[PDB]
Amino acid sequence: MDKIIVKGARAHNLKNIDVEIPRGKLVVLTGLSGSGKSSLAFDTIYAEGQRRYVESLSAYARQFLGQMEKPDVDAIEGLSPAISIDQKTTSRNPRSTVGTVTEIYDYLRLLFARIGRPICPTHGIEIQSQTIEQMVDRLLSYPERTKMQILDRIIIKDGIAARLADSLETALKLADKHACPYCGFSIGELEPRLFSFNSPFGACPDCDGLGAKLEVDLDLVIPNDELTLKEHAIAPWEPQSSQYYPQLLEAVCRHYGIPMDVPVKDLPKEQLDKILYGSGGEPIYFRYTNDFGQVREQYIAFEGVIPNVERRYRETSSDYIREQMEKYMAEQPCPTCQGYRLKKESLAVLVGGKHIGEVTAMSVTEALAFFDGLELTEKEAQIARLILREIRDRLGFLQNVGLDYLTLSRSAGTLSGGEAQRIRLATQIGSRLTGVLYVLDEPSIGLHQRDNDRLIATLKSMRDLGNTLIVVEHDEDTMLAADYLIDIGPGAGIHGGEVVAAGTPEEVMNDPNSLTGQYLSGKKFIPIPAERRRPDGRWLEVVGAREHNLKNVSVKIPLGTFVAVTGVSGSGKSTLVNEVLYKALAQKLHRAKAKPGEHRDIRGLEHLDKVIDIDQSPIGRTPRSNPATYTGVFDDIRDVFASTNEAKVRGYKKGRFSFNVKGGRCEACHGDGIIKIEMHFLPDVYVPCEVCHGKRYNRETLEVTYKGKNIAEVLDMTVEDALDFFASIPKIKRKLETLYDVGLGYMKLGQPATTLSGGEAQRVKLAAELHRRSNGRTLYILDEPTTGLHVDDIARLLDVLHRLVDNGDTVLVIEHNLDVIKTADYIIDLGPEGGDRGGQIVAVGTPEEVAEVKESHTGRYLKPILERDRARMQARYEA
Amino acid sequence: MDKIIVKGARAHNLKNIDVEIPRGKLVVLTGLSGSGKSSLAFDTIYAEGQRRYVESLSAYARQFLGQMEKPDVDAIEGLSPAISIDQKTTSRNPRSTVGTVTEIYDYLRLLFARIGRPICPTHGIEIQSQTIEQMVDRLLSYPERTKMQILAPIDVVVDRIIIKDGIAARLADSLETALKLADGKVVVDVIGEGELLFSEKHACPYCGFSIGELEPRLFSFNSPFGACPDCDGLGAKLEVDLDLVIPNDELTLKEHAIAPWEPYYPQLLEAVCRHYGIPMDVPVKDLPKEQLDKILYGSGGEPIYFRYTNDFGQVREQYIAFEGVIPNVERRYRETSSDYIREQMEKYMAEQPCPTCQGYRLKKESLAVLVGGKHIGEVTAMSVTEALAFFDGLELTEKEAQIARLILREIRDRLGFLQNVGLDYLTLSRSAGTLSGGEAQRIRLATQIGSRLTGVLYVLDEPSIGLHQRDNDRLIATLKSMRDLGNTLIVVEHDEDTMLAADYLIDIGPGAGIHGGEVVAAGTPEEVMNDPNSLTGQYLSGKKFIPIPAERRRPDGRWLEVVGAREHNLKNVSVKIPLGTFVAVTGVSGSGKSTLVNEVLYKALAQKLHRAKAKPGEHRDIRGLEHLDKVIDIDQSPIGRTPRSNPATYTGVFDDIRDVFASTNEAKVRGYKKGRFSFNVKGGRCEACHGDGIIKIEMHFLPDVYVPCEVCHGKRYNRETLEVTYKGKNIAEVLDMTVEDALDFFASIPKIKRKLETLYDVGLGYMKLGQPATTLSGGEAQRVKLAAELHRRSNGRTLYILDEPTTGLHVDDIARLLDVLHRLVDNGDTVLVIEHNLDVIKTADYIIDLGPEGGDRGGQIVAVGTPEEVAEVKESHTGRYLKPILERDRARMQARYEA
Numbered sequence A: 001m002d003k004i005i006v007k008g009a010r011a012h013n014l015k016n017i018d019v020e021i022p023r024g025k026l027v028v029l030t031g032l033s034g035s036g037k038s039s040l041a042f043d044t045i046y047a048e049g050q051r052r053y054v055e056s057l058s059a060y061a062r063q064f065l066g067q068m069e070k071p072d073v074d075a076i077e078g079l080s081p082a083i084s085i086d087q088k089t090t091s092r093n094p095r096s097t098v099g100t101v102t103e104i105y106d107y108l109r110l111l112f113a114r115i116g117r118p119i120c121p122t123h124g125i126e127i128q129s130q131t132i133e134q135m136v137d138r139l140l141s142y143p144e145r146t147k148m149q150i151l152d153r154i155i156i157k158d159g160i161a162a163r164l165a166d167s168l169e170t171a172l173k174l175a176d177k178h179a180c181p182y183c184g185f186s187i188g189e190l191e192p193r194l195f196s197f198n199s200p201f202g203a204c205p206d207c208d209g210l211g212a213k214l215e216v217d218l219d220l221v222i223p224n225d226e227l228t229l230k231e232h233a234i235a236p237w238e239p240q241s242s243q244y245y246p247q248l249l250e251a252v253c254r255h256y257g258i259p260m261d262v263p264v265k266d267l268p269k270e271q272l273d274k275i276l277y278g279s280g281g282e283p284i285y286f287r288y289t290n291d292f293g294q295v296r297e298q299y300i301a302f303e304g305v306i307p308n309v310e311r312r313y314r315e316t317s318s319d320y321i322r323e324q325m326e327k328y329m330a331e332q333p334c335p336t337c338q339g340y341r342l343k344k345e346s347l348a349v350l351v352g353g354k355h356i357g358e359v360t361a362m363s364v365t366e367a368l369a370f371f372d373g374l375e376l377t378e379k380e381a382q383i384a385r386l387i388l389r390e391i392r393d394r395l396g397f398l399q400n401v402g403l404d405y406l407t408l409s410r411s412a413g414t415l416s417g418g419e420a421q422r423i424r425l426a427t428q429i430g431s432r433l434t435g436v437l438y439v440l441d442e443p444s445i446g447l448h449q450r451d452n453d454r455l456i457a458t459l460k461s462m463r464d465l466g467n468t469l470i471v472v473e474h475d476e477d478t479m480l481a482a483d484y485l486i487d488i489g490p491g492a493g494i495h496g497g498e499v500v501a502a503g504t505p506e507e508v509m510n511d512p513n514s515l516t517g518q519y520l521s522g523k524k525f526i527p528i529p530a531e532r533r534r535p536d537g538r539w540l541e542v543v544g545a546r547e548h549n550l551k552n553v554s555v556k557i558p559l560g561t562f563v564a565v566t567g568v569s570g571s572g573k574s575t576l577v578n579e580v581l582y583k584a585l586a587q588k589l590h591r592a593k594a595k596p597g598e599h600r601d602i603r604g605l606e607h608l609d610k611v612i613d614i615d616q617s618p619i620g621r622t623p624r625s626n627p628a629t630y631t632g633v634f635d636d637i638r639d640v641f642a643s644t645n646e647a648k649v650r651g652y653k654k655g656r657f658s659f660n661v662k663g664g665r666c667e668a669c670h671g672d673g674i675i676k677i678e679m680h681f682l683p684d685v686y687v688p689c690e691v692c693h694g695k696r697y698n699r700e701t702l703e704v705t706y707k708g709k710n711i712a713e714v715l716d717m718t719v720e721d722a723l724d725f726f727a728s729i730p731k732i733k734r735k736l737e738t739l740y741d742v743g744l745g746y747m748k749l750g751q752p753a754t755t756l757s758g759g760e761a762q763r764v765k766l767a768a769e770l771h772r773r774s775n776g777r778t779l780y781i782l783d784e785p786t787t788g789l790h791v792d793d794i795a796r797l798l799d800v801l802h803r804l805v806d807n808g809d810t811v812l813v814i815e816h817n818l819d820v821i822k823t824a825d826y827i828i829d830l831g832p833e834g835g836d837r838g839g840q841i842v843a844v845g846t847p848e849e850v851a852e853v854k855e856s857h858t859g860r861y862l863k864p865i866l867e868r869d870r871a872r873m874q875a876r877y878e879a
Numbered sequence B: 001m002d003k004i005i006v007k008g009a010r011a012h013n014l015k016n017i018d019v020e021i022p023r024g025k026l027v028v029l030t031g032l033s034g035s036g037k038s039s040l041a042f043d044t045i046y047a048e049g050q051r052r053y054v055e056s057l058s059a060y061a062r063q064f065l066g067q068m069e070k071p072d073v074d075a076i077e078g079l080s081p082a083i084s085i086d087q088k089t090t091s092r093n094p095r096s097t098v099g100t101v102t103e104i105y106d107y108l109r110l111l112f113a114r115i116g117r118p119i120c121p122t123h124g125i126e127i128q129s130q131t132i133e134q135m136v137d138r139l140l141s142y143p144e145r146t147k148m149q150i151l152a153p154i155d156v157v158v159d160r161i162i163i164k165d166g167i168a169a170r171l172a173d174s175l176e177t178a179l180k181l182a183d184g185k186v187v188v189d190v191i192g193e194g195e196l197l198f199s200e201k202h203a204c205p206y207c208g209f210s211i212g213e214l215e216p217r218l219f220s221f222n223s224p225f226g227a228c229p230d231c232d233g234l235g236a237k238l239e240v241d242l243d244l245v246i247p248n249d250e251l252t253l254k255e256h257a258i259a260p261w262e263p264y265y266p267q268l269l270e271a272v273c274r275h276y277g278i279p280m281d282v283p284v285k286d287l288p289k290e291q292l293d294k295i296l297y298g299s300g301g302e303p304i305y306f307r308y309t310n311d312f313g314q315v316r317e318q319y320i321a322f323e324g325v326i327p328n329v330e331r332r333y334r335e336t337s338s339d340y341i342r343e344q345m346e347k348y349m350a351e352q353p354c355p356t357c358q359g360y361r362l363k364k365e366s367l368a369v370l371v372g373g374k375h376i377g378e379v380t381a382m383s384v385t386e387a388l389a390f391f392d393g394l395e396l397t398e399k400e401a402q403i404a405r406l407i408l409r410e411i412r413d414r415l416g417f418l419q420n421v422g423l424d425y426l427t428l429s430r431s432a433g434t435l436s437g438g439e440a441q442r443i444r445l446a447t448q449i450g451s452r453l454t455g456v457l458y459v460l461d462e463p464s465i466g467l468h469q470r471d472n473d474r475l476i477a478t479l480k481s482m483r484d485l486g487n488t489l490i491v492v493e494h495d496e497d498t499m500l501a502a503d504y505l506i507d508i509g510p511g512a513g514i515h516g517g518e519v520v521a522a523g524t525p526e527e528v529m530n531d532p533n534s535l536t537g538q539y540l541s542g543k544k545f546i547p548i549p550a551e552r553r554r555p556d557g558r559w560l561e562v563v564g565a566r567e568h569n570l571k572n573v574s575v576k577i578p579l580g581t582f583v584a585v586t587g588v589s590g591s592g593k594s595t596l597v598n599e600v601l602y603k604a605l606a607q608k609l610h611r612a613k614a615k616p617g618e619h620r621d622i623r624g625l626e627h628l629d630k631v632i633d634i635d636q637s638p639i640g641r642t643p644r645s646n647p648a649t650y651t652g653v654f655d656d657i658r659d660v661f662a663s664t665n666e667a668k669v670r671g672y673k674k675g676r677f678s679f680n681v682k683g684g685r686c687e688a689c690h691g692d693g694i695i696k697i698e699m700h701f702l703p704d705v706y707v708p709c710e711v712c713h714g715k716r717y718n719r720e721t722l723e724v725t726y727k728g729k730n731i732a733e734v735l736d737m738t739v740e741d742a743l744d745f746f747a748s749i750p751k752i753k754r755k756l757e758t759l760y761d762v763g764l765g766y767m768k769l770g771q772p773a774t775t776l777s778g779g780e781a782q783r784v785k786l787a788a789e790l791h792r793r794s795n796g797r798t799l800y801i802l803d804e805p806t807t808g809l810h811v812d813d814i815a816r817l818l819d820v821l822h823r824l825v826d827n828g829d830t831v832l833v834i835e836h837n838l839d840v841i842k843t844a845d846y847i848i849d850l851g852p853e854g855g856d857r858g859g860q861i862v863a864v865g866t867p868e869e870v871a872e873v874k875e876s877h878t879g880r881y882l883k884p885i886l887e888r889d890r891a892r893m894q895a896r897y898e899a
């Protein structure tokens, strides 16, 4: 019927709830972070919709997925095969481009094979291929009585087509295509797989369809050009728990007279040229002590430090040894394929004057403009009719979702969470399906407010195509434009998990019991600081940052304040804030090997000792890591189990209760507790270790109890419940208090790092630094901490962030969310528009000064919000 | 929007066609065999629906499938995830049952886990398990001042207590202490001397016997947690059948009475005889029992003198401890790890229920748990009608029913869904691989009905297959239900009623192969019926139809006589099959037609006429065996299991087709012979695919796909081999020709011609000589086999047995096939068919209708004789539905004859 009813849902924290979802409409789930949206939307609805379909693809699939673990639900009538558009399902596995992911490149390959005019490299003339039917009608269009000899002698008049057709047949059979008249050169046939770099049937030999080769870089070899060579200045030759190269280094220095303890910056160019590139055949006396202790004198003609790295990387046939040498190397465009990844004769076929590689190299805009100005013939346009419209709609979708700044050539594994999510969303719009249950997860992530009205436009277009959407958003604009809106459980964890209010946005907005509803009408909101932290003389000063789309950018960052880097997606925020600033500061302060982006210099580095990048990357890459392990709480929590009498008499200490060591862990899962099961076309799944039923330890370890709870149940506790459980212990309590303030409090201590969200993982990291003795000289960089947080959750995360600034430290954040931006003291709005047309400072200073900039897109949307919230405070102030 | 539009389809023979299908309705694709229905319905619409969805399940999913070969279509907008209901996606793989495939068995495991009462086999008392909370209030219900000593197993005494009121504190903690010392078990000696005793686990108070906890996997046979140890959840053993070791209990032992020991072993008999004094010239029947036991079961250690002449000729005397003829087979079968030596010994063995698990397939303690007085295995062993009855009569408590409410309804619905489809006769225990094509297909339909999916595009393939005309309205009724659940159905049918009941009806291409591929007429079945251009409408309107014969072949004096057949549900049946006539064995599904026709009749005639090894079904005897020399069973099974086989091969035409190439001018000078052109010999085949032509790609959850070899582009031969030409076409090109274009092309060679003609006469002619057998329809395969027998010198003493030869044919096509079958009867042979298609039944000269209703309410002869004689039997469903068709077409002819 016209609605999908979900009877009795008990996912995680869902309280055996029933809910109605209006079919064929735009539904939007909302509520506090942890209330249980995903549990319903994804773990319950998407899971069933998908399983029920796949299950019916064969008799085998049903048997496999049948014995598997299903979602805890009584029933769910009205289901449709479901499709998810989240960060998990997208790709991140190298050799894959944006063009390949979106499927556009495949249509390009097909395009080139159908109408691509092949040209001769040497001659630049289009090599043709005619049948006898086309040759005869072209020869016949000459003046009469014109003697011609096929090599038999004929004379053209009128009815000679009988011979000419048969004479050219004998000639072609006597001398045997797309060949060049003046040199034989050819390429038999034009098939799509000739333009594929994932097929040796048309891939570049000297790189195997990779495009970029990989050589040594002078920058990575020596991080800071000013380092004492005695204390290891050159990186690759650092004591690897065994000293051979450190001794060779001395042998070269001692011979040429290179001072060991001098900073490399003030060392003559020749002194350094011998060490890096070699003696050039001149023998150097070299004696060294083996790890055993015995000496061995040689007389080698030192190759140098650079050729050494290239030669050691080249010669090994190990996926382990290479990776140790790849840390001091960087990619370079392949000299043969010019970085286009195809054969030389594959690039010989061009369409609108440009070849397959050049079109892939264009940004979505450039290439969209290209296909409008492509001037084809009648024959060409009639063939490519549908192939062309396909490329035009896909480029269009991408442009709609706000990704028009990135090229089709761009590697897949270098895309942001939001970028990937939206590339999948665009790629899906292209499938033009109907009667499907699309379930999206916060599609505005990494998208500016300006470009939000199109996202609402495309979602509704997809909905109007006969589908039903279920989006999980926290944005006002989208919730107001939704047809139906479901708010979930008051509070989060054991507190939420119920349907607080459901109805039209007007109804939910006027519902007193809706936590979200109150924020929509204005009865509850984020307040603007009455006064803002005026900056002082402490400034960072990046100079001449050019990297990607940056236009010789030169900006100044005020320390000891809440800084917010803003600007539309593609403007170069990542580049300036992370690729340039962080890596740069990082190798100076922490001496990390990360090569910074192209920039001139950065001053004011004498104002801080440590820069920390609170990334949105995972906490760990296995179920070993968890909030406890990362924060070291679990490390401290084991001492208490070692204190109990059971552990004393049995002789247990802080090892039997460990998670990694052989002591008391479960041998069947090797400590994991959760075995990963293999899903081929579907994403991987985690099934509990059937030997210890997911308890993490054998039957003899967890017998030790501390307050009626064993080590398993204590690790299974929640953060909120645990700080109540560990009220007395004053060291364990301080670490749990960080996790609570952070924004969690609802997640469990044992919860495997792999399952944690992007935003969740970031806060577990933010919690580790949260409570530390700060010296007032330390910079924190957070990339969109709002990702996955309710408007209310931002208010409590801002209180936490602003606590760091009060101390004196700095907190730089990259946000599009207007509420986090308005709370900030200083902001740096980046590039007008994205891509090539951006990459420059549009407006600096306090939110108000930025707001009154007619050219800033950020300030334009911030002005009605600042004036919206300024009147609300004045409305509360008077009452 | 409100309709699914397909623009420019070119699948196989489709002529770049555009077509509109109404969304959310019962659309029925119809037309001649090979017109292009599957090419559109399955190879185009369904193909796209599945891919587009699966292609979105993950990143890797897109990369794998995207690089492969997508269907030949310009655009197809308005798609929905598609699901196919055909024979290609039904499990034929051992260890799987009807219960597992339908998912009903899983719900039963969930039922038995939740509410299943576990009882002690030894003591037959419901073993219980109580928490401390339940133990305390049970003791507190006793009268006051009643002394009790809580002791824990000699049994150490915890503490004595007097029950008053506020003693719930101690009582609860002493039990807790007792359960901690004796581990989940504690005995309470009430001083009235009634030592009641309970535990935290499910255990018997009188013998220990426990079961721990009830979990679904404790009832599964695909889990060590529940599977039987002595057979590993198979339920069937595999041991030597005494009946197979001796075909008839009265055959001369001198002329090899025992079959396994049939040309060392012959000379060994001589040794066990000489010794025990068993006569050589012997009709086994009259041999004393001990004389036969020594030879079959062994001397039991006693030494027997045995000398024998080797194949070489030299003698070698031994002094062995003879094992016997029966243990010989079991021992020679078990020890070898050869798929060749086993299969030769497996011929003398038959399946037998596992003595450990009574054939139920689970642990003894798994069968300890029972619901309505019956255990899991018993409920599975019932027929669908039985089980459905059991749950109606099943009587439970308030808690049990409230716990199993959602489970019971699902089980109750699936049983009914199976009943709707007509499968109410088969059990839940029945092996999945033993199902027919129609059955498997319908099981998949029923399972699907239960999914309750919406916005799905189901594509059914002739769901009426193997279904009596009576049970057709229920099929039409359930299809529509699935439709009326927000889904669109695309059914490929040839039945009138199903077309008449359809909403939209597309008639595809006039003619088959290159002659078809177009959309002739498309609208309501009223619009298509009134369209002179629709070849289908002409049969629905009644302009064209299959005429009833003027007179029917009266049986002569020759009759086959099946006596006392009792195999599956057959009830001591005795039937007379008339020879030299077209016979139709009719009846509702489950009546026992297969059983009678193939399992009893064919296997019996086969063992007598051709020394076939198959063990016939339980029957008394079969006379009239002197009236025929051979019995050809034109099975609906595949022609080959590899792409190496194809029409050309099976018929043998491809053998001759290489002799022309081997004898060509270019072959002479190149030294090529009838081997370079061999599809299977390294000589000239493509070394990349080893002569397959198509590589098989590995789809994990999806069925496997066939990708053309990228090196020979599917041609099958290398570059040099196909340079040889014959009349401007090489071997790859001739292998790619249609049977119709081929006979036209090989008109000069009459030996090639006469084979190709059979394929044309048979109905084919649209398919290509090189079409992989793995891709042929069940019906197609049958007809390619029929074409083999089709042309041979008939001596008038052979019997043909075809199973539903109509499967996959238009009404117009049945006409031509009937011409072919009746030509066989004309020449003196007999054709027996097992059909539901009334157009075939009415044409028959004699029909043998089977059992009224299916299952155990069947397996008996309801009516025999001519179609009219059976038309007048009220008790025959066949007649009831046939009587009006005879009256309809008999009037149509008089209407035609009068003008």
Ligand SMILES: Nc1ncnc2c1ncn2[C@@H]1O[C@H](COP(=O)(O)OP(=O)(O)O)[C@@H](O)[C@H]1O
Binding pocket: A012, A013, A031, A032, A033, A034, A035, A036, A037, A038, A039, A040, A492, A493, A494, A746, A747, A748, A751, A755, A756
């Ligand atoms: N991977 C997981 N394993 C176990 N429990 C989880 C997992 N993810 C979330 N939960 C539980 O579900 C609740 C949060 O549900 P979730 O769907 O994440 O809410 P939201 O969608 O609003 O973030 C938490 O109380 C948490 O304990």
Ligand SMILES: Nc1ncnc2c1ncn2[C@@H]1O[C@H](COP(=O)(O)OP(=O)(O)O)[C@@H](O)[C@H]1O
Binding pocket: A405, A406, A407, A410, A414, A548, A549, A567, A568, A569, A570, A571, A572, A573, A574, A575, A576, A834, A835, A836
């Ligand atoms: N790894 C990369 N390779 C090529 N181009 C890149 C890469 N990273 C960023 N860019 C380009 O730089 C510009 C902005 O990138 P980014 O720093 O992510 O901006 P923002 O953070 O504002 O989205 C875009 O034009 C983008 O295509």
Ligand SMILES: Nc1ncnc2c1ncn2[C@@H]1O[C@H](COP(=O)(O)OP(=O)(O)O)[C@@H](O)[C@H]1O
Binding pocket: B012, B013, B031, B032, B033, B034, B035, B036, B037, B038, B039, B040, B512, B513, B514, B766, B767, B768, B771, B775
């Ligand atoms: N796998 C295949 N290989 C080659 N030809 C095929 C294949 N499948 C179908 N065809 C051909 O396509 C034509 C019609 O398709 P088909 O689906 O058989 O029609 P219908 O379903 O109406 O019988 C026939 O000539 C048939 O031989």
Ligand SMILES: Nc1ncnc2c1ncn2[C@@H]1O[C@H](COP(=O)(O)OP(=O)(O)O)[C@@H](O)[C@H]1O
Binding pocket: B425, B426, B427, B430, B434, B568, B569, B587, B588, B589, B590, B591, B592, B593, B594, B595, B596, B854, B855, B856
């Ligand atoms: N392999 C088998 N094992 C057990 N029972 C069977 C088997 N095959 C058929 N039966 C049973 O025999 C009965 C009818 O036999 P069948 O020959 O299949 O009828 P029909 O051919 O008329 O459909 C049914 O009750 C069916 O369940």
Ligand SMILES: [Zn+2]
Binding pocket: A120, A121, A122, A123, A180, A181, A182, A183, A184, A185
């Ligand atoms: Zn040239």
Ligand SMILES: [Zn+2]
Binding pocket: A204, A205, A206, A207, A208, A209, A210, A211, A334, A336, A337, A338, A339, A341, A342
């Ligand atoms: Zn290259």
Ligand SMILES: [Zn+2]
Binding pocket: A666, A667, A668, A669, A670, A671, A672, A673, A674, A689, A691, A692, A693, A694, A695, A696, A697
């Ligand atoms: Zn384990």
Ligand SMILES: [Zn+2]
Binding pocket: B120, B121, B122, B123, B124, B204, B205, B206, B207, B208, B209
């Ligand atoms: Zn007992």
Ligand SMILES: [Zn+2]
Binding pocket: B228, B229, B230, B231, B232, B233, B234, B235, B354, B355, B356, B357, B358, B359, B361, B362
């Ligand atoms: Zn068994």
Ligand SMILES: [Zn+2]
Binding pocket: B686, B687, B688, B689, B690, B691, B693, B694, B709, B710, B711, B712, B713, B714, B716
């Ligand atoms: Zn090949």
